[PDB]
Amino acid sequence: EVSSILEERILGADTSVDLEETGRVLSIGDGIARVHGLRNVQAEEMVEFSSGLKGMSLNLEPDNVGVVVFGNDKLIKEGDIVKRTGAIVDVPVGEELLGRVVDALGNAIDGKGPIGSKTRRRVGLKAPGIIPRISVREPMQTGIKAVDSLVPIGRGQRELIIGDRQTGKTSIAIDTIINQKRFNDGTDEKKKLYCIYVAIGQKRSTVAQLVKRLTDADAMKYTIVVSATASDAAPLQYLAPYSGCSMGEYFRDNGKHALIIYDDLSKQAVAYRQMSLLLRRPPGREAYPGDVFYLHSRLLERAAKMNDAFGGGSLTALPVIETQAGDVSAYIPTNVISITDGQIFLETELFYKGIRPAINVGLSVSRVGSAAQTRAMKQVAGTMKLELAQYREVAAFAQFGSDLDAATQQLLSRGVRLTELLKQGQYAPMAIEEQVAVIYAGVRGYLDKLEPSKITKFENAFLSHVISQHQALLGKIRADGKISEETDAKLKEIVTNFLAGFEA
Amino acid sequence: SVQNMMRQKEQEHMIRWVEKHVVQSISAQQEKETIAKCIADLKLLAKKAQAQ
Amino acid sequence: FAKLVRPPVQIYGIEGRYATALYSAASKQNKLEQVEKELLRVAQILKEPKVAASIMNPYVKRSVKVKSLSDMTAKEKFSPLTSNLINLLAENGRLSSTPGVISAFSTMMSVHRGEVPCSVTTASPLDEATLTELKTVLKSFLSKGQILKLEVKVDPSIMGGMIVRIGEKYVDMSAKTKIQKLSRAMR
Amino acid sequence: TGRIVAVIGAVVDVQFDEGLPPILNALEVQGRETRLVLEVAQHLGESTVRTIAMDGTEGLVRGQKVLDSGAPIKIPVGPETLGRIMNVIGEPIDERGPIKTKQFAAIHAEAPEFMEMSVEQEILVTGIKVVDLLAPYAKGGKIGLFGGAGVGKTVLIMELINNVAKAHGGYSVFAGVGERTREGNDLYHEMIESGVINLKDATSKVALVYGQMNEPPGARARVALTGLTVAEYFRDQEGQDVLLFIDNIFRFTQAGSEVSALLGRIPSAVGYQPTLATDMGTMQERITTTKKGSITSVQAIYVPADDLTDPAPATTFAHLDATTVLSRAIAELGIYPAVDPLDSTSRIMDPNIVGSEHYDVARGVQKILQDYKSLQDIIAILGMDELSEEDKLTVSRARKIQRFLSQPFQVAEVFTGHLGKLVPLKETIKGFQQILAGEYDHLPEQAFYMVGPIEEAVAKADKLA
Amino acid sequence: ATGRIVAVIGAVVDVQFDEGLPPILNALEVQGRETRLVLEVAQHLGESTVRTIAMDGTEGLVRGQKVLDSGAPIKIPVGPETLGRIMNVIGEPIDERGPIKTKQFAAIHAEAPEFMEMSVEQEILVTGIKVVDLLAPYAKGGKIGLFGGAGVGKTVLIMELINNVAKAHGGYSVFAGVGERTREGNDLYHEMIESGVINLKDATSKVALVYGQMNEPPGARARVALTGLTVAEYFRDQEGQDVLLFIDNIFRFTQAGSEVSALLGRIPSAVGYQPTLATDMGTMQERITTTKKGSITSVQAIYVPADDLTDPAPATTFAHLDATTVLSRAIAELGIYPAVDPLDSTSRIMDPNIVGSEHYDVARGVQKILQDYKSLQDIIAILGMDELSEEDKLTVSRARKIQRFLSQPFQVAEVFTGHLGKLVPLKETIKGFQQILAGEYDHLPEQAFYMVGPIEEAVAKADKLAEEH
Ligand SMILES: Nc1ncnc2c1ncn2[C@@H]1O[C@H](COP(=O)(O)OP(=O)(O)OP(=O)(O)O)[C@@H](O)[C@H]1O
Ligand SMILES: Nc1ncnc2c1ncn2[C@@H]1O[C@H](COP(=O)(O)OP(=O)(O)O)[C@@H](O)[C@H]1O
Ligand SMILES: [Mg+2]
Ligand SMILES: [Mg+2]
């Protein structure tokens, strides 16, 4: 029935005539067309040429209009016809996009079929003000033992993942998508999360490897991926951050929850600098224009925690920023630091010393603080944060230390063993009830006699025990939320029973 | 995976024949051009009455 | 400063600054038709090999190129305000761009009665009944009391249709209805 | 009227016919939903002005219509502006109805003349024991507040509002220059739960001006002028002793060097504007003590890349008269407020300004607090008992002094349960004049923790055991 | 459609047409020369005036030479007949052996394959080098990068992989040389006849060659790399074989476009490159891929200017590479050859589900003892070597034997060394490094591992040093 569906489309096609407000082309070069005419175009309005490419008019000058091109300029000759559409740029949005691969303009690139979305939304909208917001209180669970213990993330906070090349910045933001599967197949409607992933200027083979990683873990039925790759034109890597917040604001407007990841924002300031200097705008520091702060501020301020009178929705934003030689005092690493709330600083030195994920907790902060942790995690990690911070003071005495006080030998002894609890393999996100049990085994003092090399083998043995043989205790910390006095004694003989006969 | 993959092979080969075969068929229809002008302006007569 | 009347086209450039400054002085004193008849004859009396030479030749002087032009515009027909215009073009060195100022002024004076003509580019010229029918429906579209002019061009690359522009309108009925068959592919 | 000829980014060019408006006026675009105010900055010739926008610029067609106010940006000012939230153009942004008042004022206003300045220094008393003794506040001067989040800064803001309205009777304005929306919402609700703003009656003590961070770079630079017009009403018309809070001053400098680069100007040194020394001049000279009243300013200062000689924290430093620094290492010691006594400086600390009674008391406190800082290292490395008997009292007295600097605030009565104490000036000088001489040394340490004057110290030694 | 020349400034020639305007990226033939001079259109300027870039020199050009148009971009000849021939940018043969006679002509400007034409499978391609196969394994159909400064060994290490890999490979091979010394294109034509890879007598050759060197005008060092991967696109697409591709150098594609830029009318960006730097780089590097019609292994040498990997030309190629092999001058000045940095080389298949759990815990066991050796050098500078404890006098002596065991005597570097060429297999590289870490060779001095092959020769070299005391 292949002939029937092709005959179906062409009778269902609309072949109607209209008017236009055209204007000829003056000088096409390097992706900037100059059009004479078009006397009633608004700023940032989408036009379309005679070949089929589309264009967004950025400069409204007296005798001409500067329009960037969504493609390649070898199809644009001098003396063409630039018709008018009559509308600012708009993307399809809805529930139907869940589990698809889209480019920066909402077309389908995965070849399954066209989007059946019935709604449409602008990309240039504003943030909510001061009144429709409320303070962040619910936890956003990542699944990394070092993030949820020391640098937590609430549901509406902006948290920056900053670090050099090749240190696991993409991998931290790829198991946070995997970890929300345990809520997304259940019943509790106010604990589900939806993830969006924006790739800005990466090669096509890398995105084709990451969709297969999220297809394997059955985590591409609630995730959308917006791909503006390296080969695509310079303005399509500019729209693609603003084409993802417009899909993450449909879930905030309708009482649901969301998550978005910009990978990465340091390749949007470069794809926008090229568009500026070809339109002859006045440069500034490192040849960036005067409004690169206004480019990133009005994208991150769209992440908000709404209140109950508007729906109770949320939007959480995680931008990735690549530094060069660990210098965060550059132009773009200081714009996005002063906008967001806290940073996660992944070093390269700790990655080869064995600490993986290589989160430096000396420089990582979060300014929502402890108000986004559950009551169980808050009780044990408040002492762990104080215990680790006393270790980092005395880390420089470990290389030659045996003639020190027994308190200082103790402070070294707990700091090494708390570090081994923080290491974690890739694509293994845990639960908060299993996370609080492992921290409780360490911060109390139940490990200062076990050898520091065995802390990993002890932990994988202990976790597989309490899943099968103590399942009714990890339902009274998940549902309770806090850890009571009854569960404090019940957990106390558990880690004493396992530690007694362990080495076998 | 064989019944649905091979259907897309002749879906694209269907349109590969037609769009190269339309232009060789309409090139000699100059007798259709004398009505193509006569049908265009009546839509323009329908069109210029819209703004007026 | 004083105010100046705005032209209905408002073109730009170094030649539009001189076709606007004359339109702001000849709309005053009601002399917009006297300058136009003079300017279509100063275009003729410049392109003679005695006079086209030694105006673009840079090695004469500024002042003796004025005196060879201050009597040439004085003896034949002209003593209006327009004699100061040729006197001002030769002072600023802009005597080369004098066809640019003249050709701009005709279209700026055209729009006082003109209509920004059409373009029908389909095929070989057809019979008279098809031409008079389009000339009597496009008269219904202007609604401005102005007798429209029109041009016809021949372009065989369009298969069987025609494109029509009215000023800056550009309706379209052409071979782009074959390019709209991507709905059989893109769906 | 005028017409728009060119739209390039956040810079609009307007063509007029007869009424060419002067510089620093304010136009208004006709045909749009929300107010879009353009500010004239250059006369480009042939009746064309160069304007910087104040909101979004998209949707603007070449050849629209633009009116003219004939005056600069005029805001609603008055005494009924206390307790409301406004942006840079005077509009209310908290959905509590339109602000209604009698008169308006323009934001671009000249400095006071030379014959109106004060001819003498004068100390402002705020009640806090650590501020009004070691780093005192001059009336009219500019104050720099070092320290950021997690140190307890937003309590010190909310408490200096409360004490000046008690001991002096002068209200305050808060100006948020390019501040976050998430952190500019919590300060709204932290002031509600402490009484300084009130939704039921007319006993509010502040007015909020919030120019938030996602606004165009012309609209983040004029917020510190809109929030200074309101502070000039309560001095020129009523004669109060006003305060003024800017948070922070680096986002006023940095928002200046993006208007001066969108307008096509060659940058100065490291990236700033050519006019870095007059934009800091034609703002901070309106903050002065005239013959009617005064305006005092507390400003937050962020130093980029830890460079104290960068031109943004070097232009600002020539205007300040006193700096107070919030150390986090005193917040983990238990002391509140967490003001460092050794690393705070004052310019008016002088025997010919505050007199000899304030001087030789506050001089000896910083000297004794250095000797405990030098003797705390021998005790940590070597041990305790080797030092002399004359040095054991200096170890004991300096732990009495650095706990006598603590003070319970009136803004925290609900949480920590204590009573908020407001200490006048003559009690704080009398108190530390006796701790130095060994007059109250036999009492233990916890009699001095979190009290008011020296009278309530000996009334707390009786309750122990 | 003829056109005239109205301006010549440097390598940028302006050409005014009258009736027919050719589109951007075409070929224009200058009539009037004895040689062939082709102009490539780059911009439009209005009133029928284009602005071109010249492929050859511009001496002897006069204002008014009539210029023809082609109607198509630079179509080089392509096919099976081009094997064993050196050719120019525009397709002329410069081996002086006659015309390249083939049937297929192909433009050098073409699109990139879509998202549903990508392949996803990963493998491991074994080479025989001890530093490469252990810590950063290469892959079949994967893009490989060779970083490092000037004079550390990028041309020799890319000469080694033609020695090992290209003769044991089934399909064909293409070498594009972009902007390097014209001497070194003759030591390749004379080291591939005596090894029988290029054959001058019949039709059994396996290597094509495309050369645009550093004596060419800068409009011709930026279209040669597009001509290399056009011949290598014919074998992958119109045929089905497994192709290799060697490119040296590729920094001279970015630099040669930063010279014609300011005359085309563009404001410079950061430290001096063009504003369109990361777009035309990403337009070439999206054709060197493995699709569902073939597979292209690709090794590339990338010059890093004055030892700074934060320069904007090398620090944007990192997004297009799977395996990076960062060379270093701080290792090469010790005598450790090949100077590959172990703590700066990565791969996408260092993965215990792909290389097995035994290779994975050996790779990270080497980097952990080398990085912990780095922090110990800060103590020896003040204390000394002997004042250390006996426990970390052993982790130094285990690390120094791991530094020296990575250095392997290459085959094509015989004339430098005189030593012989070794080729250690993959199963022996892991078993050599387990035994130095576990402590089974603590009774040997450090010199017994310098420039050896497998671990068997490390003890045979140990006894031969002993007897000469
Ligand atoms: N927790 C972990 N433990 C061990 N290895 C890891 C871990 N996380 C990531 N890796 C490894 O690190 C390598 C690179 O990580 P990743 O690509 O996430 O870094 P990146 O900096 O985001 O990359 P890019 O620089 O391309 O953005 C991957 O090969 C991955 O296998
Ligand atoms: N196998 C090798 N190991 C270490 N160094 C080498 C080797 N082969 C060559 N070199 C050194 O590398 C230097 C540059 O060689 P080459 O690779 O041709 O230059 P470049 O890498 O700069 O293109 C030479 O001086 C030579 O001493
Ligand atoms: Mg990554
Ligand atoms: Mg070389």
mmCIF file of C-alpha atoms in Angstrom, chain D residues 230-459:
data_model
loop_
_atom_site.group_PDB
_atom_site.id
_atom_site.type_symbol
_atom_site.label_atom_id
_atom_site.label_comp_id
_atom_site.label_asym_id
_atom_site.label_seq_id
_atom_site.Cartn_x
_atom_site.Cartn_y
_atom_site.Cartn_z
ATOM 1 C CA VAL D 230 13.861 58.038 46.240
ATOM 2 C CA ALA D 231 16.636 58.454 48.808
ATOM 3 C CA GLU D 232 16.909 62.148 47.894
ATOM 4 C CA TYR D 233 13.219 62.772 48.627
ATOM 5 C CA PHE D 234 13.594 61.907 52.318
ATOM 6 C CA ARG D 235 16.433 64.450 52.651
ATOM 7 C CA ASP D 236 15.402 67.384 50.443
ATOM 8 C CA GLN D 237 11.732 67.423 51.511
ATOM 9 C CA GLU D 238 11.640 66.015 55.057
ATOM 10 C CA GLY D 239 15.201 66.161 56.388
ATOM 11 C CA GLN D 240 15.682 62.613 57.669
ATOM 12 C CA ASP D 241 18.945 60.649 58.014
ATOM 13 C CA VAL D 242 18.484 58.107 55.236
ATOM 14 C CA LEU D 243 20.382 54.895 54.502
ATOM 15 C CA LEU D 244 21.013 53.379 51.086
ATOM 16 C CA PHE D 245 21.884 49.814 50.111
ATOM 17 C CA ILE D 246 23.401 48.856 46.755
ATOM 18 C CA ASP D 247 24.047 45.168 46.035
ATOM 19 C CA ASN D 248 26.427 45.221 44.434
ATOM 20 C CA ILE D 249 28.667 47.935 43.002
ATOM 21 C CA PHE D 250 30.583 45.726 40.551
ATOM 22 C CA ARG D 251 27.424 45.014 38.551
ATOM 23 C CA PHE D 252 26.993 48.778 38.176
ATOM 24 C CA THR D 253 30.508 49.166 36.756
ATOM 25 C CA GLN D 254 30.302 46.078 34.522
ATOM 26 C CA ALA D 255 26.887 47.115 33.193
ATOM 27 C CA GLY D 256 28.411 50.458 32.238
ATOM 28 C CA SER D 257 31.104 48.919 30.014
ATOM 29 C CA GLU D 258 28.476 47.156 27.891
ATOM 30 C CA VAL D 259 26.545 50.297 26.974
ATOM 31 C CA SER D 260 29.792 52.079 26.068
ATOM 32 C CA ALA D 261 30.705 49.168 23.769
ATOM 33 C CA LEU D 262 27.307 48.765 22.135
ATOM 34 C CA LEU D 263 27.569 52.462 21.229
ATOM 35 C CA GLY D 264 30.813 52.002 19.297
ATOM 36 C CA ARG D 265 33.613 53.330 21.491
ATOM 37 C CA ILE D 266 37.244 52.284 21.815
ATOM 38 C CA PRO D 267 37.785 50.491 25.147
ATOM 39 C CA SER D 268 40.246 51.737 27.758
ATOM 40 C CA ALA D 269 42.489 49.458 29.831
ATOM 41 C CA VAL D 270 41.627 45.853 30.434
ATOM 42 C CA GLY D 271 38.151 46.064 28.821
ATOM 43 C CA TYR D 272 36.303 48.803 30.688
ATOM 44 C CA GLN D 273 34.873 52.022 29.282
ATOM 45 C CA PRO D 274 36.778 55.277 28.663
ATOM 46 C CA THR D 275 34.485 57.032 31.171
ATOM 47 C CA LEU D 276 35.116 54.808 34.192
ATOM 48 C CA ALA D 277 36.012 57.722 36.469
ATOM 49 C CA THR D 278 33.046 60.015 35.768
ATOM 50 C CA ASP D 279 30.259 57.421 35.924
ATOM 51 C CA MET D 280 31.572 56.674 39.404
ATOM 52 C CA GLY D 281 31.755 60.445 39.840
ATOM 53 C CA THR D 282 28.316 61.471 38.584
ATOM 54 C CA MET D 283 26.640 58.923 40.875
ATOM 55 C CA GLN D 284 28.466 58.884 44.206
ATOM 56 C CA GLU D 285 28.694 62.657 44.637
ATOM 57 C CA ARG D 286 24.921 62.873 45.088
ATOM 58 C CA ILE D 287 25.410 60.737 48.220
ATOM 59 C CA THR D 288 26.420 63.487 50.631
ATOM 60 C CA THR D 289 25.458 65.440 53.747
ATOM 61 C CA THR D 290 23.730 68.674 52.759
ATOM 62 C CA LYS D 291 22.401 71.277 55.192
ATOM 63 C CA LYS D 292 18.949 69.660 55.408
ATOM 64 C CA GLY D 293 19.853 66.016 56.019
ATOM 65 C CA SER D 294 22.148 63.244 54.772
ATOM 66 C CA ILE D 295 22.348 59.989 52.805
ATOM 67 C CA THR D 296 24.619 57.168 53.976
ATOM 68 C CA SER D 297 25.432 54.239 51.699
ATOM 69 C CA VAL D 298 26.429 50.644 52.422
ATOM 70 C CA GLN D 299 27.708 48.931 49.282
ATOM 71 C CA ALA D 300 28.744 45.351 48.583
ATOM 72 C CA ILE D 301 32.065 44.946 46.772
ATOM 73 C CA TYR D 302 33.106 41.963 44.654
ATOM 74 C CA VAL D 303 36.756 41.849 43.565
ATOM 75 C CA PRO D 304 37.335 40.058 40.228
ATOM 76 C CA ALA D 305 40.119 37.439 40.035
ATOM 77 C CA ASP D 306 41.402 38.449 43.529
ATOM 78 C CA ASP D 307 43.109 41.491 41.994
ATOM 79 C CA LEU D 308 42.910 44.501 44.292
ATOM 80 C CA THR D 309 44.416 46.766 41.600
ATOM 81 C CA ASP D 310 41.996 45.904 38.791
ATOM 82 C CA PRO D 311 40.407 49.187 37.589
ATOM 83 C CA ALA D 312 36.895 48.232 38.666
ATOM 84 C CA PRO D 313 37.779 47.762 42.405
ATOM 85 C CA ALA D 314 40.284 50.624 42.182
ATOM 86 C CA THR D 315 37.949 53.373 40.997
ATOM 87 C CA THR D 316 35.479 52.454 43.757
ATOM 88 C CA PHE D 317 38.091 52.424 46.546
ATOM 89 C CA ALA D 318 38.754 56.167 46.245
ATOM 90 C CA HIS D 319 35.176 56.917 47.373
ATOM 91 C CA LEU D 320 34.840 54.715 50.472
ATOM 92 C CA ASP D 321 35.316 55.965 54.023
ATOM 93 C CA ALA D 322 35.068 52.698 56.004
ATOM 94 C CA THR D 323 35.215 48.976 55.217
ATOM 95 C CA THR D 324 33.739 46.112 57.250
ATOM 96 C CA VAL D 325 34.602 42.506 56.373
ATOM 97 C CA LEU D 326 32.531 39.422 57.249
ATOM 98 C CA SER D 327 34.940 36.566 57.972
ATOM 99 C CA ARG D 328 33.645 33.006 57.741
ATOM 100 C CA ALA D 329 36.274 31.892 60.270
ATOM 101 C CA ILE D 330 34.412 33.801 63.019
ATOM 102 C CA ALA D 331 31.100 32.259 61.982
ATOM 103 C CA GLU D 332 32.443 28.780 62.794
ATOM 104 C CA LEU D 333 33.553 30.157 66.168
ATOM 105 C CA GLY D 334 29.981 30.954 67.208
ATOM 106 C CA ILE D 335 30.141 34.773 67.219
ATOM 107 C CA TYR D 336 27.278 36.719 65.643
ATOM 108 C CA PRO D 337 27.673 39.198 63.883
ATOM 109 C CA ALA D 338 30.698 37.718 62.106
ATOM 110 C CA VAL D 339 32.565 41.014 61.700
ATOM 111 C CA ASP D 340 36.349 40.728 61.833
ATOM 112 C CA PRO D 341 37.754 43.275 64.310
ATOM 113 C CA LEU D 342 41.316 43.323 62.979
ATOM 114 C CA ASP D 343 40.744 43.568 59.217
ATOM 115 C CA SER D 344 38.217 46.437 59.303
ATOM 116 C CA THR D 345 39.460 50.001 58.799
ATOM 117 C CA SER D 346 37.911 53.448 59.181
ATOM 118 C CA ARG D 347 39.080 56.778 57.801
ATOM 119 C CA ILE D 348 37.386 58.882 60.486
ATOM 120 C CA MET D 349 39.119 56.971 63.277
ATOM 121 C CA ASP D 350 41.097 59.979 64.430
ATOM 122 C CA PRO D 351 41.644 61.901 67.689
ATOM 123 C CA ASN D 352 40.497 65.120 65.988
ATOM 124 C CA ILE D 353 37.202 63.622 64.759
ATOM 125 C CA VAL D 354 35.805 61.252 67.411
ATOM 126 C CA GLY D 355 37.770 62.594 70.381
ATOM 127 C CA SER D 356 40.329 61.123 72.750
ATOM 128 C CA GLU D 357 37.890 59.034 74.812
ATOM 129 C CA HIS D 358 36.825 56.872 71.857
ATOM 130 C CA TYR D 359 40.406 56.737 70.573
ATOM 131 C CA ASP D 360 42.530 55.249 73.355
ATOM 132 C CA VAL D 361 39.838 52.695 74.183
ATOM 133 C CA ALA D 362 39.481 51.398 70.618
ATOM 134 C CA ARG D 363 43.240 51.559 70.056
ATOM 135 C CA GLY D 364 44.015 49.146 72.898
ATOM 136 C CA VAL D 365 41.398 46.606 71.791
ATOM 137 C CA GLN D 366 43.082 45.984 68.435
ATOM 138 C CA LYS D 367 46.504 45.773 70.097
ATOM 139 C CA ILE D 368 45.424 43.142 72.643
ATOM 140 C CA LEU D 369 43.667 41.193 69.877
ATOM 141 C CA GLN D 370 47.005 40.973 68.039
ATOM 142 C CA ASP D 371 48.933 39.574 71.011
ATOM 143 C CA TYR D 372 46.453 36.714 71.314
ATOM 144 C CA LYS D 373 46.887 36.171 67.575
ATOM 145 C CA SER D 374 50.662 35.853 68.014
ATOM 146 C CA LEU D 375 50.579 33.753 71.187
ATOM 147 C CA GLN D 376 48.043 31.261 69.783
ATOM 148 C CA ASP D 377 50.756 29.700 67.591
ATOM 149 C CA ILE D 378 53.271 28.883 70.335
ATOM 150 C CA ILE D 379 50.448 27.242 72.306
ATOM 151 C CA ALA D 380 49.344 25.194 69.284
ATOM 152 C CA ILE D 381 52.855 23.991 68.317
ATOM 153 C CA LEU D 382 54.895 23.924 71.542
ATOM 154 C CA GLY D 383 52.470 23.963 74.463
ATOM 155 C CA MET D 384 50.736 26.033 77.099
ATOM 156 C CA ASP D 385 52.553 26.514 80.409
ATOM 157 C CA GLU D 386 55.948 27.760 79.167
ATOM 158 C CA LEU D 387 54.767 31.365 78.703
ATOM 159 C CA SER D 388 54.894 33.896 81.521
ATOM 160 C CA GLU D 389 52.272 34.778 84.124
ATOM 161 C CA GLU D 390 51.878 38.258 82.623
ATOM 162 C CA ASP D 391 50.823 36.602 79.354
ATOM 163 C CA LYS D 392 48.194 34.275 80.849
ATOM 164 C CA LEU D 393 45.944 37.264 81.562
ATOM 165 C CA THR D 394 46.237 38.501 77.967
ATOM 166 C CA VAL D 395 45.112 35.060 76.812
ATOM 167 C CA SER D 396 42.202 35.193 79.261
ATOM 168 C CA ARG D 397 41.196 38.810 78.576
ATOM 169 C CA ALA D 398 41.213 38.477 74.790
ATOM 170 C CA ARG D 399 38.703 35.630 75.037
ATOM 171 C CA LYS D 400 36.519 37.967 77.096
ATOM 172 C CA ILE D 401 36.816 40.789 74.554
ATOM 173 C CA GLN D 402 36.100 38.727 71.438
ATOM 174 C CA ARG D 403 32.928 37.372 73.069
ATOM 175 C CA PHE D 404 31.823 40.778 74.368
ATOM 176 C CA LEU D 405 31.642 41.856 70.711
ATOM 177 C CA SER D 406 28.695 39.505 70.222
ATOM 178 C CA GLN D 407 25.209 40.989 70.464
ATOM 179 C CA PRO D 408 21.706 39.551 69.996
ATOM 180 C CA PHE D 409 19.713 41.263 67.259
ATOM 181 C CA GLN D 410 16.093 42.395 67.274
ATOM 182 C CA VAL D 411 15.499 40.756 63.889
ATOM 183 C CA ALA D 412 16.146 37.285 65.329
ATOM 184 C CA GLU D 413 13.837 37.316 68.366
ATOM 185 C CA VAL D 414 11.649 34.482 67.079
ATOM 186 C CA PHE D 415 14.421 32.002 66.279
ATOM 187 C CA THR D 416 17.201 32.143 68.870
ATOM 188 C CA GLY D 417 14.817 33.235 71.629
ATOM 189 C CA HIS D 418 17.009 35.946 73.155
ATOM 190 C CA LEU D 419 16.070 39.608 73.532
ATOM 191 C CA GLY D 420 17.352 42.071 70.961
ATOM 192 C CA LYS D 421 19.581 44.724 72.517
ATOM 193 C CA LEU D 422 20.330 48.163 71.067
ATOM 194 C CA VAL D 423 23.392 49.600 72.814
ATOM 195 C CA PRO D 424 24.042 53.359 72.706
ATOM 196 C CA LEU D 425 27.505 54.781 72.200
ATOM 197 C CA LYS D 426 28.386 55.748 75.770
ATOM 198 C CA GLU D 427 27.860 52.210 77.078
ATOM 199 C CA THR D 428 30.198 50.559 74.567
ATOM 200 C CA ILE D 429 33.091 52.898 75.381
ATOM 201 C CA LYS D 430 32.488 52.524 79.128
ATOM 202 C CA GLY D 431 32.400 48.726 78.841
ATOM 203 C CA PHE D 432 35.707 48.119 77.069
ATOM 204 C CA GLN D 433 37.431 50.732 79.242
ATOM 205 C CA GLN D 434 37.019 48.338 82.194
ATOM 206 C CA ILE D 435 37.772 44.983 80.534
ATOM 207 C CA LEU D 436 41.256 46.233 79.601
ATOM 208 C CA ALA D 437 42.171 47.249 83.159
ATOM 209 C CA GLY D 438 41.412 43.836 84.665
ATOM 210 C CA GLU D 439 38.365 45.194 86.487
ATOM 211 C CA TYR D 440 35.938 42.371 85.560
ATOM 212 C CA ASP D 441 38.449 39.574 84.994
ATOM 213 C CA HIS D 442 37.498 37.161 87.793
ATOM 214 C CA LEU D 443 34.099 36.440 86.237
ATOM 215 C CA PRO D 444 33.986 33.469 83.813
ATOM 216 C CA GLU D 445 33.777 33.568 80.027
ATOM 217 C CA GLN D 446 30.111 32.746 79.397
ATOM 218 C CA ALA D 447 28.881 35.769 81.361
ATOM 219 C CA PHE D 448 30.038 37.891 78.402
ATOM 220 C CA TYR D 449 28.577 35.786 75.576
ATOM 221 C CA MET D 450 25.503 37.374 73.941
ATOM 222 C CA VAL D 451 24.626 40.196 76.324
ATOM 223 C CA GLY D 452 23.751 43.855 75.903
ATOM 224 C CA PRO D 453 25.688 46.396 77.968
ATOM 225 C CA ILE D 454 28.212 45.692 80.728
ATOM 226 C CA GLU D 455 25.390 45.886 83.306
ATOM 227 C CA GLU D 456 23.770 42.662 82.059
ATOM 228 C CA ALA D 457 27.113 40.836 82.201
ATOM 229 C CA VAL D 458 27.321 40.591 85.998
ATOM 230 C CA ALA D 459 23.612 39.709 86.151
#
